[PDB]
Each structure stands twice: as C-alpha cells, then as structure tokens.
Amino acid sequence: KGRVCVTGGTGFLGSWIIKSLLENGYSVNTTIRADRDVSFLTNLPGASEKLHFFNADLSNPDSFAAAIEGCVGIFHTASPIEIVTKRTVDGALGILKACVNSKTVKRFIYTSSGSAVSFNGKDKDVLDESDWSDVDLLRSVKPFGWNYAVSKTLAEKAVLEFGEQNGIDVVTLILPFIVGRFVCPKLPDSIEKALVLVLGKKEQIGVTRFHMVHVDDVARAHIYLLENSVPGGRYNCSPFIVPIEEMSQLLSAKYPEYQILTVDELKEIKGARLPDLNTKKLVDAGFDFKYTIEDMFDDAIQCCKEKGYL
C-alpha cells in the first residue's frame, strides 16, 4: 500500500506502529534513537523484506532525505528528550522541513500529548482541540511535569504553524495515556502508571482520573488519517476517561488474583483528576475505535505477565 517513514522506531508507540503498518500491507522506513539491538523489530512479520533503517538527526532536515524518499506518509513519533526551546522546535520540525515539496507524501502525522492541552490554567473537566496548555503559566507555577508539557506544547504549535505556512497536510494526534501490549524492550512509563493498582502501591498513586487510549487504536488512527482525506489539523485520540475508583472495580472483578485497593480504601484519595479529551471530532471524521477499556487493560496485563513485569 506504499512506504511510510516512522521516527522513533524503537520506542513504545513507534515500534507498535511499525508492527501495525507491516501487518496492514505497508513497507516501512524508520529512524531510531541510539541507546544496539533491534531484533524485536527485525523479527516482526514482514520486516525482513519491508522494513528499512536510516541514520538521521532530529535537527538536520537533510539527514531525513533518504528516509522519506518515495514515502506516502510520515509518522513523526520521536522527540529530542532559549537553548531548550531550540532543541524542542528543531526536533519537531526537522523531518517536517525535509518533507517540504515531497513528490509523494500525502500526510504528515505528528504525535502530540495530553500535556499540550491539560495545563491551561482553567478548571475544565472536558477539553477539545481548541484548548492549549499555557506555557507562561507552566514556566512560572511549575506544576509536576511542566518541562515535558512545555516541550510538547511548543512542539505541536510549531508543527501546525510550519505545516500551514508550507502547504504540508499535517495532522496532530493529542494522545492521553497509551496502553496495551508492547514489543519494546522496556516497560512503557504510561503502562506502568496505568497499572498502578496492580503493579504499584498506594504511595505511588498520583493521577486519580486517567484519560486513556488503546495503543492499537492509536496505530489504527494513524492509518485511517493517512488513507482518508479528512481535514488536517488537531485530533484528540482519547476515547476513555477513567476514575481510579472505576479502575478498581474493573480490575478487582477481572483479576481477583491481585491485591487491589478497593473503592472504600480509595475514599478521599488525593490526586490529579485529568480532563476528558473529547474525541468527538475524530469520530465525526469517520474513525471507529476497535478496543474497549477492558481490552486495553487486559492486553497490557497479559503482556506484562509474559515479559516478567507482573
């Protein structure tokens, strides 16, 4: 169905997207972050004939020339981590600049984050694509995770602006906690946090209401937006909003083998109640989510058990 260039190939999301692309008939070009061993990628079905690796540096557009040559799509899932701002903007724009005047790329999809919309200074429990985090507020108030939030906010804004000024069909996906099975060598942070009730202790509880999405639905959304000419722009991809209390009820019933804090034990639990990132825009565009909240937790749990994290 064509060749797609995926950055951050060895990362949790990037590697899953490569797996998905290969399963769906696409060929894949990928750039990765140095740490050695990409066996978990080269062993993926179809990789020995359709997966190709390329050296590149996020800040040098020309270093991406070969990697995007002949590609129908570019999925930019990688990030670098006045000087910090430069590294952030340069890393987000590097491969996008390389895409200028491409004779084949039909869609450039940038991976964003809920951190780019959740720190807006207002107490709104439901957000949409018009909402943005306040960088000035983040830098002055400095809430937990402000550095990452500033990075994501500035990067997404730069991508949208550059795309508009250079006629590139850009789509950005605002992603919440991404959870599911994984093929990468380390336990993804988002999964470790999402499984706090079965993997961690009460002392590790921070977030008490999670916006979430199944990793395979994220891969499916990328392919959908690449194949369907719906409007470019921002799209929340966050079908679930899960209070930790509901999380407890679900996990306690489905996994009685684990010692899980009960709703009663969670009473008056203090923490961050994240906003629901309304995903109506993406659904209105025709995309259909395939997985349920139960599927998401089960895939993550079974994968963790298989790999020794549970």
Short mmCIF file of the C-alpha atoms (twelve columns), coordinates in Angstrom:
data_MODEL
# 
_entry.id   MODEL 
# 
loop_
_atom_site.group_PDB 
_atom_site.id 
_atom_site.type_symbol 
_atom_site.label_atom_id 
_atom_site.label_alt_id 
_atom_site.label_comp_id 
_atom_site.label_asym_id 
_atom_site.label_seq_id 
_atom_site.Cartn_x 
_atom_site.Cartn_y 
_atom_site.Cartn_z 
_atom_site.pdbx_PDB_model_num 
ATOM 1   C CA . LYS A 1   0.000   0.000   0.000  1 
ATOM 2   C CA . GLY A 2   3.075   2.208   -0.002 1 
ATOM 3   C CA . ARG A 3   6.032   3.153   2.164  1 
ATOM 4   C CA . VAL A 4   5.717   5.054   5.436  1 
ATOM 5   C CA . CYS A 5   8.559   6.658   7.388  1 
ATOM 6   C CA . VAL A 6   8.238   6.267   11.163 1 
ATOM 7   C CA . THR A 7   10.557  8.137   13.527 1 
ATOM 8   C CA . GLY A 8   11.327  6.771   16.990 1 
ATOM 9   C CA . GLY A 9   11.119  3.201   15.727 1 
ATOM 10  C CA . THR A 10  12.359  1.536   18.909 1 
ATOM 11  C CA . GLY A 11  10.035  3.476   21.188 1 
ATOM 12  C CA . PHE A 12  6.811   2.033   22.598 1 
ATOM 13  C CA . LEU A 13  4.479   3.817   20.176 1 
ATOM 14  C CA . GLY A 14  6.837   3.828   17.208 1 
ATOM 15  C CA . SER A 15  7.549   0.111   17.370 1 
ATOM 16  C CA . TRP A 16  3.865   -0.754  17.718 1 
ATOM 17  C CA . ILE A 17  3.054   1.432   14.721 1 
ATOM 18  C CA . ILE A 18  5.761   -0.331  12.681 1 
ATOM 19  C CA . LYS A 19  4.232   -3.682  13.669 1 
ATOM 20  C CA . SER A 20  0.798   -2.405  12.622 1 
ATOM 21  C CA . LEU A 21  1.977   -0.956  9.310  1 
ATOM 22  C CA . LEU A 22  3.646   -4.218  8.328  1 
ATOM 23  C CA . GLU A 23  0.536   -6.211  9.264  1 
ATOM 24  C CA . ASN A 24  -1.561  -3.891  7.105  1 
ATOM 25  C CA . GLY A 25  0.463   -4.265  3.917  1 
ATOM 26  C CA . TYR A 26  2.746   -1.232  4.109  1 
ATOM 27  C CA . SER A 27  6.520   -1.082  3.779  1 
ATOM 28  C CA . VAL A 28  8.393   0.879   6.452  1 
ATOM 29  C CA . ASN A 29  11.395  3.198   6.715  1 
ATOM 30  C CA . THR A 30  12.418  4.050   10.263 1 
ATOM 31  C CA . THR A 31  14.855  6.204   12.211 1 
ATOM 32  C CA . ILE A 32  15.650  5.353   15.831 1 
ATOM 33  C CA . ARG A 33  17.142  6.841   18.991 1 
ATOM 34  C CA . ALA A 34  20.573  5.479   19.899 1 
ATOM 35  C CA . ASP A 35  20.937  3.976   23.372 1 
ATOM 36  C CA . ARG A 36  22.420  -1.802  19.614 1 
ATOM 37  C CA . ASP A 37  19.619  -4.359  19.308 1 
ATOM 38  C CA . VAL A 38  16.586  -4.040  17.037 1 
ATOM 39  C CA . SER A 39  15.743  -7.742  16.913 1 
ATOM 40  C CA . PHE A 40  12.270  -7.082  18.311 1 
ATOM 41  C CA . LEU A 41  11.703  -5.043  15.148 1 
ATOM 42  C CA . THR A 42  13.531  -7.129  12.539 1 
ATOM 43  C CA . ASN A 43  11.769  -10.243 13.838 1 
ATOM 44  C CA . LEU A 44  8.346   -8.692  13.259 1 
ATOM 45  C CA . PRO A 45  6.374   -10.444 10.497 1 
ATOM 46  C CA . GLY A 46  7.200   -8.890  7.130  1 
ATOM 47  C CA . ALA A 47  10.181  -6.896  8.410  1 
ATOM 48  C CA . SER A 48  12.884  -8.935  6.666  1 
ATOM 49  C CA . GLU A 49  11.511  -7.691  3.341  1 
ATOM 50  C CA . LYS A 50  9.725   -4.402  4.047  1 
ATOM 51  C CA . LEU A 51  11.486  -2.737  6.997  1 
ATOM 52  C CA . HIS A 52  14.458  -0.445  6.374  1 
ATOM 53  C CA . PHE A 53  16.586  1.553   8.824  1 
ATOM 54  C CA . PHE A 54  18.094  5.006   8.277  1 
ATOM 55  C CA . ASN A 55  20.529  7.165   10.221 1 
ATOM 56  C CA . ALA A 56  19.279  10.672  10.960 1 
ATOM 57  C CA . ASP A 57  19.422  13.502  13.474 1 
ATOM 58  C CA . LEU A 58  16.147  15.127  14.509 1 
ATOM 59  C CA . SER A 59  17.518  18.638  13.955 1 
ATOM 60  C CA . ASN A 60  19.049  18.131  10.488 1 
ATOM 61  C CA . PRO A 61  16.351  18.097  7.775  1 
ATOM 62  C CA . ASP A 62  18.760  16.780  5.145  1 
ATOM 63  C CA . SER A 63  19.579  13.738  7.285  1 
ATOM 64  C CA . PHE A 64  15.982  12.604  6.650  1 
ATOM 65  C CA . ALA A 65  16.072  12.953  2.850  1 
ATOM 66  C CA . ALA A 66  16.776  9.281   2.157  1 
ATOM 67  C CA . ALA A 67  14.398  8.050   4.863  1 
ATOM 68  C CA . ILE A 68  11.380  9.879   3.411  1 
ATOM 69  C CA . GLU A 69  12.187  9.349   -0.265 1 
ATOM 70  C CA . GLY A 70  9.238   7.755   -2.047 1 
ATOM 71  C CA . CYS A 71  7.103   7.634   1.105  1 
ATOM 72  C CA . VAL A 72  3.345   8.192   1.049  1 
ATOM 73  C CA . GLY A 73  3.277   9.100   4.721  1 
ATOM 74  C CA . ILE A 74  5.443   10.244  7.616  1 
ATOM 75  C CA . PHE A 75  4.554   9.376   11.212 1 
ATOM 76  C CA . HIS A 76  6.697   11.539  13.476 1 
ATOM 77  C CA . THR A 77  6.552   9.917   16.928 1 
ATOM 78  C CA . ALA A 78  10.041  10.854  18.139 1 
ATOM 79  C CA . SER A 79  11.230  13.763  20.283 1 
ATOM 80  C CA . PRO A 80  14.706  15.014  21.322 1 
ATOM 81  C CA . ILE A 81  14.147  14.378  25.031 1 
ATOM 82  C CA . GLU A 82  16.343  29.590  24.557 1 
ATOM 83  C CA . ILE A 83  18.534  26.527  24.014 1 
ATOM 84  C CA . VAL A 84  15.908  24.037  25.186 1 
ATOM 85  C CA . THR A 85  13.252  25.753  23.077 1 
ATOM 86  C CA . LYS A 86  15.550  25.481  20.058 1 
ATOM 87  C CA . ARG A 87  16.129  21.748  20.546 1 
ATOM 88  C CA . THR A 88  12.392  21.220  21.016 1 
ATOM 89  C CA . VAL A 89  11.271  23.140  17.933 1 
ATOM 90  C CA . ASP A 90  14.140  21.812  15.813 1 
ATOM 91  C CA . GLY A 91  13.379  18.207  16.758 1 
ATOM 92  C CA . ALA A 92  9.697   18.577  15.978 1 
ATOM 93  C CA . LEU A 93  10.379  20.337  12.670 1 
ATOM 94  C CA . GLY A 94  13.437  18.506  11.334 1 
ATOM 95  C CA . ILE A 95  11.702  15.789  9.365  1 
ATOM 96  C CA . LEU A 96  8.777   18.111  8.574  1 
ATOM 97  C CA . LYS A 97  11.166  20.563  6.881  1 
ATOM 98  C CA . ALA A 98  12.568  17.637  4.890  1 
ATOM 99  C CA . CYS A 99  9.007   16.938  3.711  1 
ATOM 100 C CA . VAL A 100 8.670   20.323  2.002  1 
ATOM 101 C CA . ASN A 101 7.991   19.773  -1.705 1 
ATOM 102 C CA . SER A 102 7.864   15.985  -1.321 1 
ATOM 103 C CA . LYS A 103 6.512   14.424  -4.503 1 
ATOM 104 C CA . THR A 104 4.843   11.555  -2.642 1 
ATOM 105 C CA . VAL A 105 3.951   12.288  0.997  1 
ATOM 106 C CA . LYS A 106 0.180   12.716  1.318  1 
ATOM 107 C CA . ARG A 107 0.020   13.085  5.098  1 
ATOM 108 C CA . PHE A 108 2.422   14.013  7.902  1 
ATOM 109 C CA . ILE A 109 1.161   12.814  11.278 1 
ATOM 110 C CA . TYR A 110 2.690   14.252  14.429 1 
ATOM 111 C CA . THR A 111 2.327   12.569  17.804 1 
ATOM 112 C CA . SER A 112 1.284   15.084  20.461 1 
ATOM 113 C CA . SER A 113 0.222   14.690  24.092 1 
ATOM 114 C CA . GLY A 114 -2.476  15.485  26.630 1 
ATOM 115 C CA . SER A 115 0.190   17.589  28.333 1 
ATOM 116 C CA . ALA A 116 -0.148  20.020  25.413 1 
ATOM 117 C CA . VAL A 117 -3.753  20.792  26.407 1 
ATOM 118 C CA . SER A 118 -4.193  19.916  30.100 1 
ATOM 119 C CA . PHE A 119 -2.258  22.781  31.710 1 
ATOM 120 C CA . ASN A 120 -4.476  25.643  30.531 1 
ATOM 121 C CA . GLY A 121 -4.902  27.213  33.964 1 
ATOM 122 C CA . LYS A 122 -8.661  26.685  33.834 1 
ATOM 123 C CA . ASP A 123 -10.619 24.045  35.750 1 
ATOM 124 C CA . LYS A 124 -12.387 22.437  32.788 1 
ATOM 125 C CA . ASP A 125 -13.073 18.708  33.061 1 
ATOM 126 C CA . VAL A 126 -13.662 18.316  29.310 1 
ATOM 127 C CA . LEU A 127 -11.300 19.677  26.655 1 
ATOM 128 C CA . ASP A 128 -11.320 19.726  22.864 1 
ATOM 129 C CA . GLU A 129 -8.984  20.664  20.010 1 
ATOM 130 C CA . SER A 130 -9.340  24.394  20.732 1 
ATOM 131 C CA . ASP A 131 -7.681  24.037  24.140 1 
ATOM 132 C CA . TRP A 132 -3.970  24.603  24.750 1 
ATOM 133 C CA . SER A 133 -1.664  24.473  27.754 1 
ATOM 134 C CA . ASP A 134 -0.340  27.857  28.924 1 
ATOM 135 C CA . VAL A 135 3.455   27.879  28.534 1 
ATOM 136 C CA . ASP A 136 3.921   31.049  30.588 1 
ATOM 137 C CA . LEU A 137 1.891   29.550  33.429 1 
ATOM 138 C CA . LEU A 138 3.831   26.295  33.211 1 
ATOM 139 C CA . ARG A 139 7.168   28.106  33.475 1 
ATOM 140 C CA . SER A 140 6.131   30.247  36.444 1 
ATOM 141 C CA . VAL A 141 3.944   27.897  38.500 1 
ATOM 142 C CA . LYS A 142 5.987   24.810  37.575 1 
ATOM 143 C CA . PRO A 143 3.489   22.006  38.290 1 
ATOM 144 C CA . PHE A 144 4.726   18.413  38.231 1 
ATOM 145 C CA . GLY A 145 5.885   17.550  34.715 1 
ATOM 146 C CA . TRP A 146 5.940   21.147  33.483 1 
ATOM 147 C CA . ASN A 147 9.150   20.709  31.455 1 
ATOM 148 C CA . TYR A 148 7.632   17.936  29.349 1 
ATOM 149 C CA . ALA A 149 4.388   19.887  28.981 1 
ATOM 150 C CA . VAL A 150 6.205   22.984  27.726 1 
ATOM 151 C CA . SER A 151 8.130   20.855  25.228 1 
ATOM 152 C CA . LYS A 152 5.007   19.174  23.854 1 
ATOM 153 C CA . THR A 153 3.027   22.412  23.641 1 
ATOM 154 C CA . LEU A 154 5.734   24.358  21.813 1 
ATOM 155 C CA . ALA A 155 6.487   21.436  19.505 1 
ATOM 156 C CA . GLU A 156 2.898   20.871  18.412 1 
ATOM 157 C CA . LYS A 157 2.329   24.575  17.829 1 
ATOM 158 C CA . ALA A 158 5.481   24.751  15.709 1 
ATOM 159 C CA . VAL A 159 4.401   21.756  13.628 1 
ATOM 160 C CA . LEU A 160 0.919   23.135  12.944 1 
ATOM 161 C CA . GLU A 161 2.265   26.573  12.032 1 
ATOM 162 C CA . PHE A 162 5.031   25.284  9.769  1 
ATOM 163 C CA . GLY A 163 2.655   22.895  8.037  1 
ATOM 164 C CA . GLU A 164 0.221   25.724  7.333  1 
ATOM 165 C CA . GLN A 165 2.917   28.082  6.034  1 
ATOM 166 C CA . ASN A 166 4.457   25.436  3.774  1 
ATOM 167 C CA . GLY A 167 1.389   23.667  2.411  1 
ATOM 168 C CA . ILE A 168 2.014   20.325  4.112  1 
ATOM 169 C CA . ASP A 169 -1.032  18.228  5.032  1 
ATOM 170 C CA . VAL A 170 -0.369  17.930  8.756  1 
ATOM 171 C CA . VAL A 171 -2.429  16.100  11.342 1 
ATOM 172 C CA . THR A 172 -1.531  16.078  15.022 1 
ATOM 173 C CA . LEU A 173 -2.862  13.460  17.419 1 
ATOM 174 C CA . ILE A 174 -3.355  14.548  21.016 1 
ATOM 175 C CA . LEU A 175 -2.639  11.338  22.920 1 
ATOM 176 C CA . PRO A 176 -3.522  10.525  26.560 1 
ATOM 177 C CA . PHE A 177 -2.098  7.545   28.477 1 
ATOM 178 C CA . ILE A 178 -1.340  4.994   25.729 1 
ATOM 179 C CA . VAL A 179 -1.878  1.428   26.963 1 
ATOM 180 C CA . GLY A 180 -1.901  -2.107  25.549 1 
ATOM 181 C CA . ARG A 181 0.534   -4.813  24.508 1 
ATOM 182 C CA . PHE A 182 4.055   -3.725  23.572 1 
ATOM 183 C CA . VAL A 183 7.094   -5.121  21.773 1 
ATOM 184 C CA . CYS A 184 9.738   -2.679  23.027 1 
ATOM 185 C CA . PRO A 185 12.479  -3.879  25.459 1 
ATOM 186 C CA . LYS A 186 11.355  -1.832  28.477 1 
ATOM 187 C CA . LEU A 187 8.055   -1.391  30.320 1 
ATOM 188 C CA . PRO A 188 6.447   1.782   28.916 1 
ATOM 189 C CA . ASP A 189 6.016   4.506   31.530 1 
ATOM 190 C CA . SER A 190 2.385   5.060   30.521 1 
ATOM 191 C CA . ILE A 191 1.604   1.394   31.151 1 
ATOM 192 C CA . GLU A 192 3.450   1.335   34.474 1 
ATOM 193 C CA . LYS A 193 1.374   4.326   35.576 1 
ATOM 194 C CA . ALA A 194 -1.897  2.926   34.210 1 
ATOM 195 C CA . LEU A 195 -1.303  -0.321  36.120 1 
ATOM 196 C CA . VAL A 196 -0.527  1.344   39.447 1 
ATOM 197 C CA . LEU A 197 -3.290  -0.639  41.184 1 
ATOM 198 C CA . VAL A 198 -1.765  -3.998  40.199 1 
ATOM 199 C CA . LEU A 199 1.928   -3.078  39.823 1 
ATOM 200 C CA . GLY A 200 2.419   -0.371  42.417 1 
ATOM 201 C CA . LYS A 201 1.444   0.570   45.947 1 
ATOM 202 C CA . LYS A 202 -0.840  3.230   47.406 1 
ATOM 203 C CA . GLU A 203 2.189   5.514   47.803 1 
ATOM 204 C CA . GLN A 204 2.705   5.536   44.033 1 
ATOM 205 C CA . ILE A 205 -0.741  6.980   43.317 1 
ATOM 206 C CA . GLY A 206 -0.616  10.392  41.659 1 
ATOM 207 C CA . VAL A 207 -3.204  10.558  38.892 1 
ATOM 208 C CA . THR A 208 -6.711  9.657   40.095 1 
ATOM 209 C CA . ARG A 209 -8.622  10.070  36.814 1 
ATOM 210 C CA . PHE A 210 -6.906  8.905   33.642 1 
ATOM 211 C CA . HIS A 211 -7.569  9.882   30.036 1 
ATOM 212 C CA . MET A 212 -6.593  6.745   28.075 1 
ATOM 213 C CA . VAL A 213 -6.447  5.007   24.684 1 
ATOM 214 C CA . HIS A 214 -5.523  1.530   23.416 1 
ATOM 215 C CA . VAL A 215 -2.168  1.593   21.615 1 
ATOM 216 C CA . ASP A 216 -3.530  -0.366  18.655 1 
ATOM 217 C CA . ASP A 217 -6.343  2.140   18.198 1 
ATOM 218 C CA . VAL A 218 -3.629  4.810   18.003 1 
ATOM 219 C CA . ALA A 219 -1.932  2.816   15.231 1 
ATOM 220 C CA . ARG A 220 -5.307  2.356   13.530 1 
ATOM 221 C CA . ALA A 221 -5.966  6.111   13.779 1 
ATOM 222 C CA . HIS A 222 -2.645  6.850   12.050 1 
ATOM 223 C CA . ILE A 223 -3.513  4.567   9.145  1 
ATOM 224 C CA . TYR A 224 -7.061  5.933   8.959  1 
ATOM 225 C CA . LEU A 225 -5.910  9.556   8.752  1 
ATOM 226 C CA . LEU A 226 -3.285  8.622   6.166  1 
ATOM 227 C CA . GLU A 227 -5.825  6.827   3.948  1 
ATOM 228 C CA . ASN A 228 -8.807  9.161   4.407  1 
ATOM 229 C CA . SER A 229 -8.582  12.758  3.200  1 
ATOM 230 C CA . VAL A 230 -10.426 14.286  6.156  1 
ATOM 231 C CA . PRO A 231 -9.332  17.800  7.240  1 
ATOM 232 C CA . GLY A 232 -5.814  18.271  8.531  1 
ATOM 233 C CA . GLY A 233 -5.312  19.786  11.968 1 
ATOM 234 C CA . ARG A 234 -5.552  18.603  15.578 1 
ATOM 235 C CA . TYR A 235 -7.419  15.486  16.691 1 
ATOM 236 C CA . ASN A 236 -7.857  14.230  20.244 1 
ATOM 237 C CA . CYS A 237 -7.461  10.428  20.284 1 
ATOM 238 C CA . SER A 238 -8.665  9.719   23.813 1 
ATOM 239 C CA . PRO A 239 -11.815 7.528   23.919 1 
ATOM 240 C CA . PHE A 240 -11.603 6.733   27.625 1 
ATOM 241 C CA . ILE A 241 -11.798 8.766   30.829 1 
ATOM 242 C CA . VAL A 242 -11.253 6.515   33.834 1 
ATOM 243 C CA . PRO A 243 -11.600 7.445   37.512 1 
ATOM 244 C CA . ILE A 244 -9.288  5.367   39.701 1 
ATOM 245 C CA . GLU A 245 -12.378 4.149   41.598 1 
ATOM 246 C CA . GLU A 246 -13.891 2.689   38.425 1 
ATOM 247 C CA . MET A 247 -10.451 1.309   37.597 1 
ATOM 248 C CA . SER A 248 -10.505 -0.513  40.950 1 
ATOM 249 C CA . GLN A 249 -13.939 -2.015  40.321 1 
ATOM 250 C CA . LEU A 250 -12.985 -3.257  36.856 1 
ATOM 251 C CA . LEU A 251 -9.636  -4.743  37.850 1 
ATOM 252 C CA . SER A 252 -10.898 -6.257  41.110 1 
ATOM 253 C CA . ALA A 253 -13.605 -8.180  39.271 1 
ATOM 254 C CA . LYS A 254 -11.486 -9.326  36.328 1 
ATOM 255 C CA . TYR A 255 -8.225  -10.055 38.176 1 
ATOM 256 C CA . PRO A 256 -9.076  -11.422 41.651 1 
ATOM 257 C CA . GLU A 257 -5.546  -12.862 41.797 1 
ATOM 258 C CA . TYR A 258 -4.136  -9.410  42.581 1 
ATOM 259 C CA . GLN A 259 -4.371  -7.438  45.813 1 
ATOM 260 C CA . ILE A 260 -6.156  -4.318  44.586 1 
ATOM 261 C CA . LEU A 261 -7.165  -1.281  46.623 1 
ATOM 262 C CA . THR A 262 -10.949 -1.228  46.915 1 
ATOM 263 C CA . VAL A 263 -13.259 1.694   46.281 1 
ATOM 264 C CA . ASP A 264 -13.602 2.028   50.062 1 
ATOM 265 C CA . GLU A 265 -9.821  2.064   50.552 1 
ATOM 266 C CA . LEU A 266 -9.610  4.742   47.846 1 
ATOM 267 C CA . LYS A 267 -12.121 7.023   49.589 1 
ATOM 268 C CA . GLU A 268 -10.973 10.645  49.740 1 
ATOM 269 C CA . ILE A 269 -7.903  9.599   47.746 1 
ATOM 270 C CA . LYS A 270 -5.904  12.690  46.793 1 
ATOM 271 C CA . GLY A 271 -4.545  13.121  43.295 1 
ATOM 272 C CA . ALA A 272 -4.757  14.679  39.854 1 
ATOM 273 C CA . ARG A 273 -8.119  14.258  38.122 1 
ATOM 274 C CA . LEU A 274 -7.171  14.649  34.456 1 
ATOM 275 C CA . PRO A 275 -9.589  16.131  31.902 1 
ATOM 276 C CA . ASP A 276 -11.574 14.108  29.395 1 
ATOM 277 C CA . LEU A 277 -10.077 14.862  25.966 1 
ATOM 278 C CA . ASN A 278 -13.294 14.873  23.905 1 
ATOM 279 C CA . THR A 279 -12.712 12.662  20.877 1 
ATOM 280 C CA . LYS A 280 -15.921 13.600  19.062 1 
ATOM 281 C CA . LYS A 281 -14.003 15.347  16.249 1 
ATOM 282 C CA . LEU A 282 -12.146 12.175  15.273 1 
ATOM 283 C CA . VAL A 283 -15.297 10.046  15.478 1 
ATOM 284 C CA . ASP A 284 -17.231 12.639  13.422 1 
ATOM 285 C CA . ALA A 285 -14.469 12.223  10.832 1 
ATOM 286 C CA . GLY A 286 -15.394 8.572   10.422 1 
ATOM 287 C CA . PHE A 287 -12.793 6.793   12.553 1 
ATOM 288 C CA . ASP A 288 -14.101 3.931   14.684 1 
ATOM 289 C CA . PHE A 289 -12.364 2.714   17.825 1 
ATOM 290 C CA . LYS A 290 -11.885 -1.053  17.947 1 
ATOM 291 C CA . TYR A 291 -10.970 -1.669  21.591 1 
ATOM 292 C CA . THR A 292 -12.756 -1.371  24.916 1 
ATOM 293 C CA . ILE A 293 -11.333 -0.292  28.263 1 
ATOM 294 C CA . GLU A 294 -11.328 -3.962  29.278 1 
ATOM 295 C CA . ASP A 295 -9.340  -4.904  26.148 1 
ATOM 296 C CA . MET A 296 -6.805  -2.179  26.900 1 
ATOM 297 C CA . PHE A 297 -6.147  -3.309  30.466 1 
ATOM 298 C CA . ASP A 298 -6.111  -6.997  29.560 1 
ATOM 299 C CA . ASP A 299 -3.650  -6.591  26.701 1 
ATOM 300 C CA . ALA A 300 -1.315  -4.602  28.941 1 
ATOM 301 C CA . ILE A 301 -1.633  -7.044  31.843 1 
ATOM 302 C CA . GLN A 302 -1.111  -10.196 29.760 1 
ATOM 303 C CA . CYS A 303 1.898   -8.615  28.040 1 
ATOM 304 C CA . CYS A 304 3.391   -7.612  31.389 1 
ATOM 305 C CA . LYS A 305 2.892   -11.146 32.729 1 
ATOM 306 C CA . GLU A 306 4.584   -12.664 29.678 1 
ATOM 307 C CA . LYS A 307 7.563   -10.332 29.989 1 
ATOM 308 C CA . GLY A 308 8.015   -10.582 33.751 1 
ATOM 309 C CA . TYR A 309 6.789   -7.154  34.836 1 
ATOM 310 C CA . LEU A 310 3.794   -8.793  36.532 1 
# 
